[PDB]
Nucleic acid binder design. Sequence first.
RNA 1: CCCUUAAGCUUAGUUGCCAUCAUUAAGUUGGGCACUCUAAGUUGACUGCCGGUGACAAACCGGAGGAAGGUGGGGAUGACGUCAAAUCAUCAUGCCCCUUAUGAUUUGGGCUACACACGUGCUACAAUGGACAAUACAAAGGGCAGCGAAACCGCGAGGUCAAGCAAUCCCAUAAAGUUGUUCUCAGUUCGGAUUGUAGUCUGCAACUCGACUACAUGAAGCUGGAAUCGCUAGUAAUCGUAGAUCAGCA
Lengths: 60, 80, 155, 113, 202, 78, 127
Amino acid sequence: AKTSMVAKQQKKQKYAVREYTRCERCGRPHSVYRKFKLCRICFRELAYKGQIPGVRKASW
Amino acid sequence: IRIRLKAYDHRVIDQSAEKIVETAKRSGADVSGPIPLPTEKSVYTIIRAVHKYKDSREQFEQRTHKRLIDIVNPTPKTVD
Amino acid sequence: PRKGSVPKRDVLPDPIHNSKLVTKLINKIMLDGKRGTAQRILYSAFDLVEQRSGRDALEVFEEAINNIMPVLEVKARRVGGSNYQVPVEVRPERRTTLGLRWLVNYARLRGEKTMEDRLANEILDAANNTGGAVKKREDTHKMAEANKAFAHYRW
Amino acid sequence: ARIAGVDIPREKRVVISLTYIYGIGTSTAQKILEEANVSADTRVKDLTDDELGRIREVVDGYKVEGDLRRETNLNIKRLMEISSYRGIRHRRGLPVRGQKTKNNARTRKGPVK
Amino acid sequence: GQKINPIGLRVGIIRDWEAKWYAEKDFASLLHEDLKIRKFIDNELKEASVSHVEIERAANRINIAIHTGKPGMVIGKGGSEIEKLRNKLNALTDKKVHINVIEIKKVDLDARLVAENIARQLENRASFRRVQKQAITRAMKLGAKGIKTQVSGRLGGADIARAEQYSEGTVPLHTLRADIDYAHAEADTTYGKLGVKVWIYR
Amino acid sequence: SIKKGPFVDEHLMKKVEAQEGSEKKQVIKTWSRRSTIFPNFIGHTFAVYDGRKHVPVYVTEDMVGHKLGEFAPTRTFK
Amino acid sequence: VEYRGTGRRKNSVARVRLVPGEGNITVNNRDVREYLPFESLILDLNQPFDVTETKGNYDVLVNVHGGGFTGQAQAIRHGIARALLEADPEYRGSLKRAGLLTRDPRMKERKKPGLKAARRSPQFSKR
RNA sequence: CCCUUAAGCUUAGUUGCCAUCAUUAAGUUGGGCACUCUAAGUUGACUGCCGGUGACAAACCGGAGGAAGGUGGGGAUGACGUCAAAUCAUCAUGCCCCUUAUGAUUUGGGCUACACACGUGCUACAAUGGACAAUACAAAGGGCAGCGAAACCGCGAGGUCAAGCAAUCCCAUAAAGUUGUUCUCAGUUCGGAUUGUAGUCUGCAACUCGACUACAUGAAGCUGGAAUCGCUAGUAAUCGUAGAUCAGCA
């Protein structure tokens, strides 16, 4: 599921690693990150206008 | 004491170095001056196309500024 | 490339051989980008050539280029209304820069087991005529030395 | 020529050039040189009368078999012929290995392209 | 067919990297609460004129500046509104304390409230044109170098709808150093789900 | 594989050793392919398949380094 | 006395002093021939002395570091030139009809993200 | 135009780069100098009349040029609109549907494994070349759950994961061009395909449910068709420290 597979993941299916990271307020299982706890098109909105700091679009 | 300096912009950590130096300078101590450090970065790349479109991808990351200072006079003049 | 007029863009420098043609062919024979390897093949494998082949490749480098470089070329150039090729004047950057690759495509020809010794055997039976390196030069150069074509063309 | 079956070639070194005869070859051949003065000589047709006697009495005393254990292939297959693996689910089912039986090329089990 | 977000590029450079803080150790979960408090003036305030938000916390000393929208009609009397706003903010544990106030002016100067405001008064079977052009003039009457407002989704009364973008000449976006800005209108009523576009020079 | 804890099942081998009272053979029925085995296996099938039944399997001195139903058919060529 | 022996090329710098008296360039307590892998061109790294008409002028006390070896050399095309230019201040108006006194020719670029190798991108299988 | 490199005043001239001091195994202990861009807040640039005129109709050429070709590579920058496609399927959708099955528990099974014909990314097809070996250089993720040093287990799909813990500081033979042990053209000590033995360690379970492999099974192979691969500087030839993603593996 996706709209009902939120507790299954972030509740305790009874092993160390059966939590597979998913976007905080979403259900997308692929393209995710722990310390961001979100995804691609369930996260991007933030570094527009600054809600994520020091994010220049280019020029490393 | 190895006090630390940490930031994400190129104007919030020069202030950190300078201003702790000055806080110690405003009162009597042979405290240390500005010791800058390089400008580091924290990358984060990820596909943007809502579908399976790729290779039209532009670099997307951030800049994590990390500086360091020593307080070379522990004093009861300007410590806190 | 809307324009052109590009040169060799290099100031050919040599180590301890004192030559300007022994440094423009060290990168051509340079097997899979091997500077020192080719540098040791141009100071120990190109110096012991006399011991194996017969003569040294020091001052006899001009006989391995001038006695093999062709003149008439074979490039399609429509002119008038037919379809006949026209040769380009053998210029320094179009005869010595392209006519100096007679050691990379001929290194895998000499069937004398040892490939390293076969690469040093390209100076023998090729410095003069009727050889295995000038055999492809006689099937090109000798093809328009008598049959003249257009002289008022562009190339 | 003498170690197992025959092995003819010359001009080369006897240390690992054993690869022909099953079970062992080259790698182990040059790594099993555990004897009294046996070594590669580059003269495969010289220098050898009785040294082979001892460094062969080992190969007979080398109870780890080699050719003699060519049949551990067949016999570990024999155990598995109940449709298990390597004999029933890999020999009685006519499939390939790599567990990509067929997405890439295959000549040894399927020799026909 | 692409003019991408200048909400998304002109950040830090002139308008500055909005989200502020480092935190030495607490990294993922001081942000696990930040979208819900930074977007708390657009979710529990019903997306009301919020022009931009912010987060600032190290040292366990959080404060957050915010327009407070257009103030006075939400605040009311004696201050018994924003005290309960703080009641709703910190009581997670200590989250989003002291969310201060500098007042904001001119509803028809800046695109942010205009966005969801013109996601409101077109779709009411009134000739959405007659009011489209109305708030087009009212915010290109001031004197900015234009606001190019246009409805991209589901105009008309008939079924098959297009993205008709009725813009008015010039409102830059390629002043890389200065700021151009997109405040968006994702609404609908009785009919489908609508799309509008807005671009201001300040 | 590793040594040190072959993973004899708790429930499953309980069902065995306490259903291995007599010679009566009730083997697995388990439609599960995860077990691990002892020397005291006594004549019976398994069910190492889940199509719409329960599959007889090898019983006597079968594959000896394994901890599952290595010999149990589900398919073949076609 | 010759100070400010400096000069870099391809992400690989050195700093090479020059000493009043004789001349011998010496990097990392080694020579112009026993620190570079074989690359028969040990006299070349000092042709900033043989475009100079005089070569044994000033001993170095040089130093190195870097990532590879090709970028490590061919910068000391300035390891002489910089300090040499400084002490001999005749060296701007008579040292370019060969091309020595200052050159700083090429450097690196960005490995493209998603492409095989910067210029190399996903090739076409067929059509 | 703001930026990635750039003579640069410098500056972190402490952990920084090592002429000055030889107190310098990466614990750059050191002057707490520099010696120089260097570790960026990078700062400059530009048609700069340019040496010319085209007979002039502007430009541009180039005398070599500021340390970077005429915008400083140029990074970012993306005309109307063509494209019924790019998403009903990772995302949000107006729309109606199976409703103790299409969901559902772990699964039996399965987007790898046939009876085959093609597209794939490089290492294949020895006389400087493997099974094999003394062994120069560190970039840059890192790491609050990670890497392993000098020495080192060198048989891999790493391990005790022991010590320095944001320029540094751990993967250190990083792989070659550096002397090149080793197999004189027989499928030959080139092989890591199957008919073989199977394995590094973190799994609630390798029979069809990936590996590449060493114990080395010695096969594809010796230049190429009706059928195929980089290209004016270090980009690729070849690999390369590793790993984002995540209890195995590019």
